[PDB]
Design a protein around this ligand. Structure first.
Ligand SMILES: *[C@@H]1O[C@H](CO)[C@@H](O)[C@H](O)[C@H]1NC(C)=O
Ligand SMILES: *[C@@H]1O[C@H](CO)[C@@H](O)[C@H](O)[C@H]1NC(C)=O
Length: 536
């Protein structure tokens, strides 16, 4: 005659290892990284021996032992998230009794409590299989969920191996992150998020988009993690082998890096990064987009020859930080970086020395030519130099060789692909029907900001005959031209992306990567894995 069947009393059945204040605007008030979740039960058997023994069972393995007996309560620690079956067991001299199981959710940024992401392969995306063994990466921007309507559930995930999340900002006010003042509302936004937080620690530029904004699958009022991070958690559960990296910096956010000559700040940075990774477990390492060591970035008042040395010390300590994290986590972390393809910026850093600590070098072989000049027109992301300009040194090919010349091993170089277009308007005074010899009166009409056009748009407008398509066979780069208004646009397409693929394969490079994922209709990513020799 075992004791009576226990009846649990209702308490909340959702707990969080990492807690998120779904109503905060600062980062310190937003997230609490805890080491374990506190789970509490309350049960009751009417008229029972209170000296009976009692156990709480999560998925039929024991988590708590006591007496309880009749009308009892138990609290305990759980260190790994998931969806559990909770049972309270009573025990006397004859046998045991169990209660009807109830499901609880221990949430963790692991994604353990979540189902796999439900993704979309819309548009011209065809499913591939990562048989190449080569890197196929793409950038996902944080702000892409507002007027772009590109949530994480729209990423064609079977066609990537790595995924870069842009961007992770670094705390700091006046002087430290002045580059954000160029973009409306951004500086004020970071300052809100970094309020009460020491400068030179990592944070989140937009807490709403990252963790609070309701997207597909995460609409509930009681979802601990939502937004982009929420869906990124659902992604590691769809494709566990898909590397998801956080990108720190970028063009308008790289300003604080120039202060890392200071031992004190660089150690505080690396520290906050370590916690950042423990706080957000779906990440698989660190990506550093310092633009650029030495200068020539957004801020004209920042830069130093000594920057090249601090770049090599930052990666040495970041690697060590990840090493002693692998120790504790038992996991592997990738350390990567997006560097310039300009030889004048490559010079500053000894990448042959930095490569010891790194895995992947995202060679930004794009943005060579743009609307920031009226009379220097050219190819933005061409492979080689054009016929009319043989001594062009800002090409994909030249930069790679220049980087290889340092002593960098080719397996670590990941060539960049442009999923967008840089353009001009009012091109005039050109010769031989070659618009690049002409000059422009301004930037072309842009998709979001003028001077930049999404490939999605370009491809559509070509099929409507609103453009003239030309392909430079020598430089391996397409462009479109409208003789009337004098509009000229540089970009990458299917053809040139394949040739970047052949180049990587022939020269035994690392693979390809694209900026940005939402500017594609599926044609360039397809060219990316056909060119790298993937399977369909
Ligand atoms: C291009 O030309 C227009 C008018 O000639 C001028 O307003 C603009 O500042 C120029 N842009 C650059 C980058 O020189
Ligand atoms: C374009 O601008 C440059 C500026 O130095 C000038 O030398 C050149 O003649 C211009 N080309 C035309 C076709 O006006």
């Amino acid at each position: 005659a075992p004791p009576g069947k226990p009846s649990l009393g209702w308490g909340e059945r959702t707990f969080a290892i990492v807690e998120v204040n779904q109503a905060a605007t600062a980062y310190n008030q937003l997230v609490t990284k805890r080491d374990s979740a506190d789970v509490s039960v309350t049960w009751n058997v009417w008229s029972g021996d209170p000296a009976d023994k009692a156990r709480v069972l999560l998925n039929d393995k024991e988590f708590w032992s006591g007496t309880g007996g009749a009308a009892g309560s138990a609290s305990f620690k759980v260190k790994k998230g998931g969806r559990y079956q909770m049972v309270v067991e009573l025990c006397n001299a004859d046998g045991c009794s169990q209660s009807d199981a109830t499901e609880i959710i221990v949430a963790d940024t692991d994604g353990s409590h979540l189902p796999p992401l439900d993704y979309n392969m819309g548009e011209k995306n065809k499913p591939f299989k990562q048989t190449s063994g080569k890197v196929v990466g793409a950038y996902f921007v944080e702000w892409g969920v507002y007027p772009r309507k590109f949530p994480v559930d729209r990423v064609p995930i079977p066609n990537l191996t790595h995924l870069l999340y842009g961007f992770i900002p670094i705390c700091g006010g006046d002087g430290i992150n002045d580059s954000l003042k160029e973009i409306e509302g951004s500086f004020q936004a970071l300052q809100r998020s970094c309020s009460g937080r020491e400068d030179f620690k990592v944070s989140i530029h937009d807490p709403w988009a990252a963790l609070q904004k309701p997207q597909k699958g995460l609409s509930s009022w009681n979802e601990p993690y939502k937004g982009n991070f929420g869906q990124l958690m659902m992604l590691k559960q769809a494709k566990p082998d898909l590397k998801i990296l956080p990108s720190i910096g970028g063009w308008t956010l790289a300003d604080p890096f120039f202060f890392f000559t200071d031992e004190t700040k660089r150690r505080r940075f690396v520290a906050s990064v370590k916690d950042f990774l423990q706080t957000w477990k779906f990440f698989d390492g660190v990506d550093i987009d310092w633009e650029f060591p030495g200068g020539k970035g957004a801020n004209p008042n920042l830069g130093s020859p000594k920057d090249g040395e601090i770049y090599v010390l930052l990666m040495k300590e970041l690697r060590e930080m990840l090493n002693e994290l692998s120790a504790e986590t038992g996991r592997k972390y990738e350390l990567t970086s997006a560097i310039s393809a300009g030889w004048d910026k490559i010079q500053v850093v000894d990448y042959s020395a930095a490569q010891k600590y790194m895995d992947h070098i995202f060679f930004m072989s794009y943005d060579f030519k743009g609307a920031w000049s009226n009379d220097t027109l050219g190819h933005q992301a061409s492979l080689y130099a054009p016929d009319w300009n043989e001594k062009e040194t800002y090409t994909t090919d030249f930069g790679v060789q220049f980087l290889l010349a340092q002593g960098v091993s080719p397996k670590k170089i990941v060539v960049g692909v442009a999923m967008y277009g840089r353009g001009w308007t009012g091109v005039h005074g050109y010769k031989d029907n070659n618009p690049f010899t002409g000059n422009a009166t301004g930037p072309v009409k842009g998709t979001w900001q003028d001077g930049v056009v999404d490939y999605r748009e370009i491809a559509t407008e070509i099929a409507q005959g609103k453009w003239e398509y030309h392909y430079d066979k020598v430089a391996q780069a397409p462009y479109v031209f409208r003789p009337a208004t004098g509009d000229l646009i540089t970009y990458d397409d299917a053809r040139s992306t394949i040739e970047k693929g052949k180049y990587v394969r022939a020269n035994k490079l690392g693979g390809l990567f694209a900026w940005e994922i939402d500017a594609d209709n599926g044609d360039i990513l397809n060219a990316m894995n056909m060119g790298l020799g993937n399977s369909a």
